[model samples]
Structures are given as structure tokens and as C-alpha cells.
Target: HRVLHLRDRLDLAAELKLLCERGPLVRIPLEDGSAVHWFALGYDVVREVLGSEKFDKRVIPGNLLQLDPPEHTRLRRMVAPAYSVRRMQALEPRVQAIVDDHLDTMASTGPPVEFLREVAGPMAARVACEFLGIPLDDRGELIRYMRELAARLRRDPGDGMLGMVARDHGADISDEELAGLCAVVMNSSVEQTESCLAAGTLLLLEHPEQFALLRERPELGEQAVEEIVRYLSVFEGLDPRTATEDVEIGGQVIKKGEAVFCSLLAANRADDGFDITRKESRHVAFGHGIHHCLGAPLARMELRIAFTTLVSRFPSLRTAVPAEEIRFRPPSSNVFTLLELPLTW
Candidate 1:
């Protein structure tokens, strides 16, 4: 037996990506010669993992991401309609209104404001509140709550797993437990976009050619965000899943209850898999199968409105500072985030 389970997992990402898009699906031997059972493969894996009733979400238990079948299916169903196109359309005037308010602030000081901190981040913060039906005046209080809660969710397992345990207590956890659930889900949902928008904006700034394309034709705004989502590919790796019963594919056998982590980011770039240009590219950004993101429409709508307005004004938006100067957090393996961004006209 290998003394270090973490080392085996350290390469879990590389190995899984290979198996997902180009490699095999069978359990393979580790460098230490230890072999684990079946893992995962490309786009279908989300449904293969999450769509199944067997792979329990309780690997960590209680956390929103881990809610196993039946309940997971039901809960997600309830929230899906909240983000339906009709609902998002209803919120559009308000969404665009909030975005314009932020852009006005960015233009307030002058042309060279750091779009990330001053604009994108604030835009996402305020829009998230409105998206969730929170009161406008209460955005500050909610922003505080969302930030702390997001940090907690992003905390690693090595960081004591207390965040996981406490959050798990949230699953069926009532009252305060329910409060925990609200914190994790809403924060995870809302604030992430700010970071994504920041990164996407940075990319456009760095690649002036891409920025020029948008400048020449502002119509690419929404599609540009999609390209960013595809290019940046958030989430280092999704949670691990195990087969409840034997699952066979690619001549490998995934035994009952074997842990496997499906790489959504990998699938997003899979060969002949995720053709972002195609409507059915198996893009798993919001997740896949029945367990897909409940906030899908809301996230898209927010991104759409955000990019459209930003491009409309700062048709020449670019970074205010040097590219390498921008800092990423000290501890990030899965999430691609920015500490801050500096943008200018």
C-alpha cells in the first residue's frame, strides 16, 4: 500500500484529463505500483457520474455539491425555473440598469480605471444581489456574507475539512444548517462570475487583437463571454464519484463504489467533444445531466448584460497595469481567480 494517498491524488488531474479526452477508462497502476479502480472519461462522465442514482453526493456529505440522487434531482428541479429565460428576461431591465450604474462609476474618475476592481467585481456583486431578489440597499451586508462564505467553500480539505463538515451539516440540516446551505450555494453562485469576468477582461486586454474584434463589432459581447468560459475553464476538478455497481467502458471495469473525479474543464476542451461553436458541445460549465447548474440562465444572462454594456462604453478598454503585475491567490489548485485587475481605456 502506498503510504501517501495524497501523492496518488496529486497527479489525479493529469491522469484524469488524459483518460477523459484521450486516455483509457480503466484503473491503472500508480508510480508506486499501487492501482486504484475505475476512474472517468470525457463529456458523458457527468451524467455517468452525477446522473446516476448510485453515486451518492455524501462523499463529503451534507455539502450542496454532494447531494446524491433523488434529493439532488428534486432540489435542482425546484431551482431551475428560477433562472428560466422568462424570469431572466423579467430581470433584464433591472440587470442592465445595475450594470450601467457601475460603468458610470468606472467612467466617473476617468478612462484608465482598473475595470476588475472598480467595475466588473462590483457589477457582479450588485447584480448577484438583484438576481437573488435581495434588496438593493442590503447589497453591502450580503456582499460581506457572500465573500466570507465563498472563502469557506474554496478552502481545501487539508485546511481541516471543518468547512466541509459544517457545510455538510447543511444538507438536510435545518434552521442554522439551512443557513449554511444558503451561504454556500448563493455565494458559489453569485461571486464567481466577478472573478471570471475579471479574468476574461484581462485576457481581452492582454490580447488586443481579441479586444479589437469586440471593439469592431460589439455584438460579440455575449459570445465573447462564452468563449471566455470555454477558454478559462473554471474549477480545477469536480468532486469524485464512484460506481455503485460495476460500470464497464473502454475495456476497463469500474467496480462498485469506486471513487472517480470527472474533469469538467477537460471535457470543455475535449477533442470532437466541446465545440463551443456547436450548441451541443457537451459543455459542462453548469454541470451535466440532471445535476446541471440551477443558475444556468441567470449566469448567462448576467454575463451577457455585463459584456454588452462594458463594450458599449469602453470600446477601447485595456489594462492599466502590466500583465505580470496582476496577482493570483497564494493557494489555488482548482479555481483560476485574480487578486485584482487593472484596466484602462
Candidate 2:
């Protein structure tokens, strides 16, 4: 049996593609060498495992990503309303303002600018702060806490999303739980969005023709964002789920209490290549089933606005450094992102 070490994030894509070619599911040793788990590589099997009731995500109070139904449903309901497509549309102008503000700053600062630091990072943090109703002044602090304190840091529900959740469901939800929710939102919004923007920029630079298509037909922004999300598949794999009972998937029977890992990168590769004109996207980059990313709409809007505005403003945008000289976030980091993406027009 081959051992799959997720820590090798840099080359995992090629490895996963190879595995997918062989079969949809394969048993691989856990990182800690505790036990082997069934890894789902293909789109169908990964979707089944994610959607099926046979597997359950671990539960942690207030951590939506780790919670199961009933509890998951309850907490999700509180935040789902704010992320509605209508709400995101309403929020678009504000999101656009934030993006434009950052781009303006980037332009003033001149080229050979670090896109991650100047644009992606701060823009994402500011947007997350807006979504959560945290004071914009405290954006830096919130980011610090998210990276350092995680669930440990205590934040009194502010006037934003956290405050709304508290106002409506405060009696039912604990302060700690509220903090957990805030942490989840912050974690998902900032780092992931930052990664997407930086990586998406890199991808566009790598494929000038695709970038040109987007520049020529700005209406393709939506499709371009979807394609970027599918192509990059920033999240290599989803959190592991445990089989609640013996269940068969991809021709293998996962025994009760066994762990299952789904590779979003590989599953999304079922139809390869990056083309914004593609009409349909069945990628599970946001996960599938009940646990699909709640921040997806917000993310999509942000990416669309960021990319479209970016290309339109600076038609000649290109990497300041050679492609090979660019650095990626350390392999230990789960999310794929560039360490610093220097750009110029």
C-alpha cells in the first residue's frame, strides 16, 4: 500500500492525479502513522463520501466545519441568511468599494508591489471584518487573533454579523460558541480569499490567452471565477470524515469508525485544463452536501470583482518576478497560496 503524506502539498496534485488514474479510492496511511484511511480521489466517490450519511465530520462546539447535523443545522441557519445571494448582491457595492480602494492604493504604491500584502491580504481581512460586523479599525487585531489565538481569543459580539447572531440566538448560543463561529468565519474568509486572489493572479499570468479572453469579455467574470476556483482547487483536501457504519464507496467497503479523506484537487481534475468559457462546473472545491462552504457566495463575489476590476484596470498586469522565482506558502500550510506575489503592469 502506498503512503500518502499530505504535508507534501507542493507536489500533491501530480501525485493525486496519478492515483486517480489508477482508481477512485485508495487506502493510505495517516500522517501520524496511526492507521490507514480510505482516500477518495475521483469526483464521483469524493462526492458520495461527502454527501452520504454514512460518514460524519467530527463535532466541536461552535466550529461549523467540524459539527454534524441538528447542531450544524442550528448554527448554520443563524449565519446562512446573511450569505444569501440577495444579501451578497446588496453587499457587492461595498465589496467593490473595498476592492477598488485597495487597487487604488496598489496603483499609487507603483508596480513591483507585493500583491498579497497590498491587495489580497488586506482586502480579504477588511471584507471579513465587514461580514462579521467587526470594526474596520480592528481588522489588524482580528487577523492577529485569528492566526494566533484561534478559538482561544475571546471577542464580545460586535455590531456586525456576530452581534446579529448574538441578538437573535444569544440565549441559545454560548459566548464561547459565538467566538468559535467568529473564528470560523475569519479563518475561512481571510486566508482562503487571499490565497485565491494571489493564486488566481498567478494562473492568469501563466495563461495570458485566458487572461486576454477575460479582459476582452468582462461578462465572463462569473465563469472565470468558477473556472479559477475549479482549476486552482486551493483546498487540496477536505477535513477527514469518519464512517459511522460499514459502507461501500468506489467499490471499497469502509468499515465502521474508519476515516475517509476526499481530495478536492484530484476530484476537480476529472475534467482538466482551465477555460472560463466552460458552461458547467461540478467541482467540489467548496466541498459537497450539508457541509459545503457557507462563505462560498461571498467568496465568489469577491473573486469576480477583484479579478474583473484588476484586469480591466491594468490590462498589462504581469508577474514582476519570474514564475520559477515565486514562492508558495510552506508545504506545512494546508491552503495553497503564494508567499508573496509581486506584480507590475
Candidate 3:
């Protein structure tokens, strides 16, 4: 029914920074939360967990997040070739056209289009399906499964979308590896586009004053999206890795198999000079280290196209509902989504 998060690094890091600054590797307990086997908390911890040869992702076998190295390196290698830079660049104009076409439909659709259905949902689904070489029409089934797996993924000690995708696709990936790809796809899936767009719309709509600012200056969409990501801190926490080997993190000794969950939302607002806390933030929304999202370029294209066209086309747009009563999807999804958003111009 509600959501809360520490909006500042000092607030979040209060416990974490204390642990790191006071000592080295700290084992802040999970006590049963998240699908990861163990979570690491600090920047040093994340780096150590992800970068260490001792803690490999592939050995985790089917655990997508746990892919350690070599094999983790190999699988990522397989996927990387598929998303070649040339391949993505070729898809750009096609991407822009898709956005323009979608916006055109939104403008013409019967008024009060479910923003989810009209734009965000379709945009993400179509883009993902296209990249994976799946037929667009066939994806309704896939996206349906995503919705179910999501709730469990959000708040349970069990697995989520990766398993679902792998199961449905047969043995394209190891049941374990399938889990990883499922996690990859689930994580990569344009899950957040809809929510990001919706929230961005609401922000602009609320500050109707921003309307003219937008009308006169259409180039603000890109910065606006970043602003939302920083301001909203939509995603909550991530289950990190527990170092098995005796490693020095920020000069602390991290033991084997402890749980740590880093808060991206927290990191975004972190006082660390990483830029998340800056008035002009440049936080790594995807992640830091080698595991940074491979699908980022594609996502950037999609969001840029989606948000720009949305506001430009509907410059006169305003919310038909009250600010409070208005239903908005929780912005916590990997691709935080809005199930339905009824907007009246």
C-alpha cells in the first residue's frame, strides 16, 4: 500500500559507512530476503564480489546474478556478439520511427489511453522482442508471464522471471543458465520504461509551469529522464554477493557467505562523488563493474524516443485525475511499470 527509502547516502550509508569506515568487510545480515545466495553492501564489496576470481558467476550455475567468471565471461561473450555495436546502430532510425509511430497513435487513439498500453508497455515489449528476433505479436504471452514473476521477484527469497522465461523457452539455456538469462532479460526488459515515462509525464503535468518550458525547449527530455531516475530513486535494493575468500574490502575482512544488498536508489542519492547525489546526477542506474548492463544502449534509444515524442505530441496534456487519487504504478520494478494510467487531456 506504500513505499519508503532513504533518499540520501548519508542516511543509507549511515549504517553501511559506519561498518566500512569502522572496519573492513562487514556482514550485514539479510535474514531471508531476495533471490541471491548472498548480498554485499559497500562499493568495495560489490567490486570485490563481482571482480574476484574466487566468487564466480558461472559456478552459481543457474543463478544468473551469481555468474562468477570464465563461464560467466563466456556466456556474456555469447550474448555480447549478438548485440554488436553495428547491429544496434543499424536499429536506431527504425527505433525512432517506432516511437514516432507509437506517439502518433497515442495522439489519435480514443482519449484517455492507458499510457501503459498506448506507449510504454508496447514500446518495451516490441523493442525487446525485436532484439531477440522474436515476433512482436507472440510477446503478449511472454509479457503476461513477466507480470506474475515480478511480484515474487520483488519481495521473496525465491526466484522470479528468469525461471519463467527459461521454462517457457525450452532448454535454450541451462536450467541454471536459463535462470541467468531470464534474469538478464527480466533485468534488461523495458520493464521500467512505462513507469519512467508515466512518472515523467506526471512530473511535468504537476508542474504545468514546466509545460511552457518544455514547449519552448523540447531538448529537455533526455535530461528530464535522468532527473526522474535520480529524483524518483525508483528501484529499491539489490541483493549483493558474500565473499567466500578472505578478501580486503575497504580494508575490512569479508568472510565467506554473508549477505549484503546495495540500494541503487540509495547509491543514486549517495554523497559519494559518484554523481548520484549531485544536483546534476550521473549515477550508474544500470550498475557498476563488469556486470554493467549490456543492453543499455538499446534502452537509451527507446527511452529517448518514447519520452520526447510523448511530451512533444501532447504538449497540452494534463492529468484528468486528482494528484493523490490518481493511480500510478509502483516505480520499484527493474523496469518499474505502471499497470494502468488513465490520462485525460
Return the top candidate by lDDT: 2
Residue clash pairs of candidate 1 = 57-66, 57-68, 62-168, 114-343, 236-334, 243-257
lDDT pick, better of 2 and 3 = 2
Q: RMSDs, each prediction?
A: 8.3, 3.6, 8.5
| Candidate 1, poorest ten consecutive residues by summed lDDT | 1-10
Candidate order (TM-score): 2, 1, 3
| Off by more than 4 A, model 3 | 1-66, 136-188, 207-215, 218-221, 270-280, 327-339
| lDDT of prediction 3 | 0.53
> What TM-score against the true fold does each predicted structure earn?
0.75, 0.89, 0.68
Q: Report the lDDT tens digits of candidate 1 across residue range 139-201.
A: 577676544543444342111122333344334333343344445545665556876777777
TM-score of 2: 0.89
The C-alpha stretches of model 2 lying farther than 4 A from their native spots are 1-14, 29-34, 144-159
- What is the Cα-based lDDT of residue 83 in candidate 2? 82
Summarize candidate 3's per-residue lDDT along 189-260 as a digit string, tens digits.
Answer: 556555566665665666676555655665765555566665444454554554566665555555555434
Q: Is candidate 1 or candidate 3 better by TM-score?
A: 1
Could you tell me how far off, in angstroms, the CA of residue 46 lies in candidate 3 after the best superposition? Answer: 5.6
